[model samples]
Target: TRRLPPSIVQDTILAVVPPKSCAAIVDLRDWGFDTFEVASRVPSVLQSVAMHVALAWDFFASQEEAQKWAFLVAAVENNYRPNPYHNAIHAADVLQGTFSLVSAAKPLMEHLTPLECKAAAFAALTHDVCHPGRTNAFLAAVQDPVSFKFSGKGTLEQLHTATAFELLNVTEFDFTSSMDNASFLEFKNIVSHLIGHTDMSLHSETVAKHGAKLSAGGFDCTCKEDRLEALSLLLHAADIGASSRGVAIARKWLVILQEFADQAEDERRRGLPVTPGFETPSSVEKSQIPFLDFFVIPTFDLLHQLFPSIEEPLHNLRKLRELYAAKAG
Candidate 1:
């Protein structure tokens, strides 16, 4: 997309700031940060969270501060499609989750340069920009235009990464505008790799590939791909880790319910098979175990294995599994 009008971007950023009541609460650097609470109070939840993380992480230069807010405002407001689950708020939550994971993985973080850290955070925030709230299966079944846009594979992810970069191409919104071409390319590579790995389809291969590398030899900070892979693993884990968010799990799960419901309805309308669990409350509850078993736990477990310090999320996932099992039984 073209650059958003400067007037619109400024006004949007100003208007989207969190209310005074939420000021203190919204500044958290912890995994316990309540994204929904901030979502309820702020006009643009992603902008508030993004700005806070960007500043806290010192992602931008002092002179490029204007570019930071304008870029975030333009990107969140324009690119993130509205959905009960996959909207800007969800991106904000993933950003926070990624932050917490990075914080926990101190060994890994210690080796990464400041630029790598910023890319990891930014990747999580914009990973799902322009999501359709439907599975890739549904996208293929419906012959969604974007499905054909990126070699017919990981179409949505490709679109998201491409769309985010398109916004960055706009001079006013390019926060990395000051970077030399070489560093800018490196930044783009890291961000794009992390965001691309957010596609659930790549989950198993990612785990296997990264797991083997870590097992053979720990991540090599000197190797660019190694650094990128480590960050990608963390971002992927964070993307699927809402179940491990302790007290925030229930509220967060509900946000995804309506999005699933919408997708199921669309599938029925098209005579396409509805994704299991999405068809009824019973199925949804019953599928919770398998979902946790096959997706959530494995990702977090692999992450913990890679960075043993990052055990909290894996611990929380196991507890959540037990809780869901008890309910289902």
Candidate 2:
């Protein structure tokens, strides 16, 4: 009895209603929205990205084809959600963040080929498709099956990246089938590099090496080959960017972190010796603001030099860190 919206038939339509509204509609009836004569649509990461791409194409004529593929890539990858942070919604968010970074660093983006832009956008959207809901530390502490399997080095990231590619290879999702093998390989390489670079551990090395290259000439120095590197760093930056965003977002991240810390506390109280680094929240100062100043802000400071346009946004982030640091006392 589910009802499909009239617009559902439109080939170009992306994004159904938001989940919050769908829940509201279901809550109103006995059998709920599910049982209504019309089929209810679920929002997927692809649909959201497609909508954005379509909208982008309408605005930028040169990117029309790129936008089409963006939508297709997003829709196909929307099927899986790994961890809390790697869900389809988060993918959509990363796409938005990538777009924001591109806009902020226009000089860097202007030189990118349409294919490069598509690859960057697609990589961000699918980078963490199946995160295991535990950090590398947490997995190692528990001696997780995967930890032993991966031998303790970036197991989670490697697995997630591989899985995302596997998803792409499935015949139904092979949007690249039309491309010649060489073009497909190029696209695949770009995606692999982008996802592989998303690990935080890679950031320091990247900054140490490419940081100098970027700083020497400012944003103009970045090239399309460096686009994947830059986009990867941008993703990592946004992952922790909340800390620098302002008090509101920083506090939100803190609450989530605290919840994670609390889980460790609960495990310890149950007679398990808490994993060494996974100690309770008391081990570190409970204030996230100080945490940001000590860790997150400094990270972005280096990133700012690589993408100078990020300075204003990062300045606001620093202010938020300062506010939290003061209040923590």
Candidate 3:
């Protein structure tokens, strides 16, 4: 993807982010309807982001600074692949999901410092930056260099982290230039680990280790490794947390995913073999159902056990089924 010209980027950086007090304007919860509808409005989405960071969380105590970062983030978001899904709006949705997950475990969050919270928020917004609207499987099939270079695992996830930092270094988003070297490195490492965990390849092990800790009598925030692992699980879960978000959200996400699959199918028609499952209507339905049961359902179930206070994800299947029934009716 090409960078926006400096002129356009500068103008975007100055766009209005509604005062933090005007946050009553939009609710990030109604993702299917609210977020996407106004996402085109620039500050509409940026305002909601700032409100979450500035008003709800102490991410950026300076309202002015928060608003500045909101626009800067917006510019980075605009640079995302203009695909049918997995775009900036999805990043915004994930951010909202991250915010909710963090909020849900409020008491448990006490272990994290303000920098960690910033890491979580930033991780959500930039985790999928510059996505090619394709999957790791497709990249590997095409022998894409990115896949070849990042040979170990989570090729795309690592790429996303690398790309996000590149974007950040472009002066406009030098978010860490003000920090001391130690703090800056720690922040970079935190964001990198959190984004790396979003790769689905590591999901099973993350859940496994997380469950082990939970069964062994719960987490101790004092333990840095334990705390980092907890954050990783929360983010990975949030990355794929659409199902737990209910019917409206899930329906919206499925439509988006199917559209991306359609793009991948276009590649197949042109002679490249893209990942096959999401192509036809029935194909997606077939895959999504089992995926929800085996992967999605189990994930939220474990998360509920880990943080029982965060009850919503646990009951997502019922909520999703209710939504499907109402729609069918």
TM-score winner: 1
TM-score of each: 0.87, 0.71, 0.83
Q: Residue 222 lDDT in model 3?
A: 86
Estimate the overall C-alpha local distance difference test score of candidate 3: 0.69
lDDT per model, in order?
0.71, 0.55, 0.69
Name the candidate that leads on lDDT: 1
Angstrom error at residue 89, model 2: 3.1
Model 3 residue 96 CA deviation in Å = 1.0
Off by over 4 Å in 2: 1-46, 54-86, 148-152, 218-222, 262-286
Residue range 1-329, candidate 3, lDDT tens digits: 54322210111222222232234444443323335655755545634664565456666645555655655575566656666777777787777777777667755587888778777888888888777776787666666667765788888888878876776675555655567889878888999999999988887887787778888977777887777777888888877877677665676677566665676776778597555555655444445666677778788888888887777776766677555555445
Span of 10 residues, lowest total lDDT, candidate 2: 28-37
* lDDT for each residue of candidate 1 in 267-315, tens digit (9 for 90 to 100): 8987988887675465455567788789888887777777878777777
Better of 1 and 3 by lDDT: 1
Which of 2 and 3 is the better model by TM-score? 3
* Model 3 C-alpha RMSD to native: 5.5
Q: Model 1: how large is the Cα RMSD against the reference?
A: 5.5
Model 1 scores a C-alpha lDDT of 0.71
What candidate 1 gets wrong by more than 4 Å, as runs, is 1-27, 247-251
